[PDB]
Each structure stands twice: as C-alpha cells, then as structure tokens.
Design a protein around this ligand. Structure first.
Ligand SMILES: Nc1nc2c(ncn2[C@@H]2O[C@H](COP(=O)(O)OP(=O)(O)OP(=O)(O)O)[C@@H](O)[C@H]2O)c(=O)[nH]1
Ligand SMILES: [Mg+2]
Length: 409
C-alpha cells in the first residue's frame, strides 16, 4: 500500500514516460482516462470513480508535452501536474532554481495525496539539457524536502555525437545520481539500438520503437508491486536485495521474450538461461568483472520446483560469474501479469557497469583538456569548476565498482 510518484523530465524523460503510462494502463485495464491488483501504488482514485497517474510531467519547452496532450491519452494525466517554463545542464540546473516553487506545488501536492509514500522515480536522460540540468537539481532538492523518501531512476544514457557536450551534462549528472539517488536503472541507448536493429530487424530504429522496449522493462520491474504478493511488495524490497553497499547501486537490465511468432517448448529454464546471455543485456561493455547480485522476475505459470532445477544447471555450467567476496546468489520472483507463455526480466548490479562511467570521463577529460565549448556553460554561475567536484566523485564510483570485483573487497 506504498505509493510512488513519478517525475518525467525533458523530451526523453517525458517520452519513455508516455509509453510507461501507456503500458501500465493496458495492464490495469484503465482506458486513456478511466477504468485483484494494486493500482494505488502508481495511480490515484479520481473524484469521479476514474483513474489518474501520480505523474509530474516537467519540461522546459512545450513541443513534447503538447504532443502528449494533443494525443489519445491527453485525458489521462492530471492537468495540474503538467509544467512548462536550455540545451546546457547549466541552463537546466538553472531554471529549476527559478521554477522551484511552481514545481513543488505539484510535487508536494501529490506528496500529500499519498498516505504512505515510499519515494520517487525520475525518468530522464543524462545527456541533453533539461533531463540532466533540471533533473540534477530536483535530485538535490528531493534529497532535502524529503529525506527519508527513497529515490530511484531510469536514466537514459546517450547512444555510444550530435550534442557536443553530452560528456559534460552526463558527468554533471552522474554525480547527482551517485550520491542523490538510491537506485539507478541504467538504460544504454546504444544497447537499446543494437537490439531494435538486431533482435528486431529495423535499420533506422526510432525513439517510439526504442522506447517500446524501455516501457516493457519499466513495466516488468514494477510487477511485483502492482500484482503484489507476500514478499517483494515494497520498492525498497527489490532495490535492497540488489544493493549491498551504497554508491554501488547502478543496475543493468534485460528481457527474454523479445521477438518471433511455433517453438517446441519454452520453460523458465531457457528463460533464466538467456537473461544471462549478454546479448539480451541492455547495456554495452568492452575476465575479472562480476555480478554483485542478480534478480529475475518471471511471469505466468512456473511451479517453483522447476526453478530450483534451473539454478543448478547454472551452478554447474558456471553461466553466472558472481563476486568472490560473498554469497553468489540470484533471486527469482514469480510475479503475475494482468488478466489480459513464460516471460522473464533481469535486474543486476554488475561491475562492468563502471565501463559507461569510464567511457564518459575519457570523453570528458578530452573535451576538458581543450576547454571545449566551455562557452555557454560558463554562462551562468560556472565562474569556476564544480566540474572537478563531479569528475572526482564519478571516479570514486568507478573505483569502488572495480574494487568490487577484487576478492579483498
Ligand atoms: N530511449 C530514448 N532515448 C531518448 C529519447 N529522446 C531522447 N533520448 C536521448 O536522450 C538525450 C536527449 O534528451 P532530449 O534531448 O530528449 O532532452 P533534454 O530535454 O535534451 O533537452 P533540452 O530540454 O533541450 O535541454 C540524448 O542522449 C538522446 O539520445 C527517447 O524518447 N527515448
Ligand atoms: Mg527538450
């Protein structure tokens, strides 16, 4: 009975968000407006026996939000939750301070509506301006206006440019994602593509097509909260299981049934089996590294006897290389689906996730060791360098994540 409020920022933020609410709606049998599962967690009971999502659509430009509003779901969202006011993280981190008040009026209100709020989900992108700039700002404010309230995020990492400063905004955000966020579901645009392109066969994969994937995961990873059971009914119940120590709290995901249309047999076996095949992992990396915990959420019929049998085959084929300094264990979670074949979702805190952070700095340093485009960011309270404060921090994240693969740990 724990509520979750969702903050959607920037195009990226608000587009994976649109899809997100399109997906959950389908499941809970809600129409683009209104109507045993737990809807409360993500929805609110309208003053007309109808439904509306606990979502805050924030953007610094009208284009994207009006597409949603001039769409089939315009009637779903809570009108007073839609806010509209730069390209730079500085410009984004900026206006937030400017829009602060106007924003929390919507944030604190939904914050009231909830009786037992757990925390916040922030959909957004790391590159870009608003998502990172405004988003980093919120992540700092949220960490004060609500100190106990947990914070998770679905952060979209850029593909592999055409922004020029992605490596800037990105570092400046990864910081606020390291210390001002409890859980960090990492969505790698590169990885999303490969799939869309490969395991789907689309030469020029669009964002709609790409976001269709993200919705699936954004959707699956929250099934145990919406079709609740005895164990795993708190968001903190999931994250806790995936985060032994702080900082190290960046996860990577993956889904099994991705294509086709018949097979001879598809059991939970080849479902857990594939979730470890990196080809299905939505992140890009390039011995040593190992998982720090693994979760698998299977939907539909399963009979927990078969599951023990699947783990064993893994233990002997050594398919999963876990940490050396502790209990190598993967958690399964047999969740339901909505009343409308198997299906599996993996969420892991794996070491090589440091790879993306590394891939970002090298780009940063390079662009930094030339004082590149520093003219636009230094255009508002960047009369020195918070930049350095961030790099160092991010380096810490790469330091512990690697140090995490050492038996010493
Ligand atoms: N998966 C996914 N990635 C996206 C989507 N839209 C943008 N991105 C990525 O996210 C970044 C773009 O953020 P937008 O550019 O979407 O948002 P911020 O709002 O950029 O920009 P400004 O408001 O102009 O400051 C780039 O790294 C894009 O590759 C989307 O719908 N889905
Ligand atoms: Mg934008």
């Amino acid at each position: 009975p724990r509520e979750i409020i969702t903050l959607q920022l920037g195009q990226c933020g608000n587009q994976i968000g649109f899809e997100f609410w399109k997906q959950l709606c389908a499941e809970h049998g809600i129409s683009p407006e209104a109507i045993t599962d737990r809807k409360d967690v993500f929805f609110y009971q309208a003053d007309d026996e109808h439904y509306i999502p606990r979502a805050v659509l924030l953007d610094l430009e009208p284009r994207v939000i009006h597409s949603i509003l001039n769409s089939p779901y315009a009637k779903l969202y809570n009108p007073e939750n839609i806010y509209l006011s730069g390209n730079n993280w500085a410009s984004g981190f900026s206006q937030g301070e400017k829009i602060h008040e106007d924003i929390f009026d919507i944030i604190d209100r939904e914050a009231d509506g909830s009786d037992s709020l757990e925390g916040f989900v922030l959909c957004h992108s790391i590159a870009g301006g608003t998502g990172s700039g405004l988003g980093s700002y919120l992540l700092e404010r949220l960490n004060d206006r609500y100190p106990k309230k947990l914070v998770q995020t679905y952060s979209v990492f850029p593909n592999q440019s055409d922004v020029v400063v992605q490596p800037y905004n990105s570092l400046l955000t990864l910081k606020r994602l390291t210390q001002n966020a409890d859980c960090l579901v990492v969505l790698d645009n590169t990885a999303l593509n490969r799939i869309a392109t490969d395991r789907l066969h689309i030469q020029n994969p669009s964002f709609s097509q790409i976001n269709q994937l993200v919705s699936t995961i954004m959707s699956a990873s929250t099934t145990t909260l919406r079709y609740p059971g005895y164990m795993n009914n708190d968001l903190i119940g999931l994250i806790a299981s995936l985060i032994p120590t702080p900082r190290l709290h960046f996860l990577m995901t993956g889904y099994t049934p991705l294509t086709t249309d018949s097979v001879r047999k598809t059991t939970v076996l080849d479902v857990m089996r594939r979730l470890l095949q990196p080809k299905n992992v939505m992140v890009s990396t390039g011995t040593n590294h190992c998982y720090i915990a693994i979760l698998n959420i299977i939907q539909g019929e399963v009979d927990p006897t078969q599951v023990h049998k699947s783990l064993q085959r893994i233990r002997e084929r050594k398919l999963a290389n876990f940490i050396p300094w502790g209990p190598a264990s993967i958690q399964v979670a047999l969740s339901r689906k909505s009343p409308y074949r198997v299906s599996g979702l993996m969420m892991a805190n794996h070491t090589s996730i440091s790879s993306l952070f590394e891939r970002t700095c090298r780009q940063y340093d390079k662009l930094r060791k030339r004082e590149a485009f520093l003219e636009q960011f230094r255009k508002e309270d960047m009369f020195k360098d918070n930049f350095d404060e961030m790099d160092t921090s991010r380096e810490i994240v790469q330091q512990l994540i690697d140090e995490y693969h050492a038996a010493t740990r």
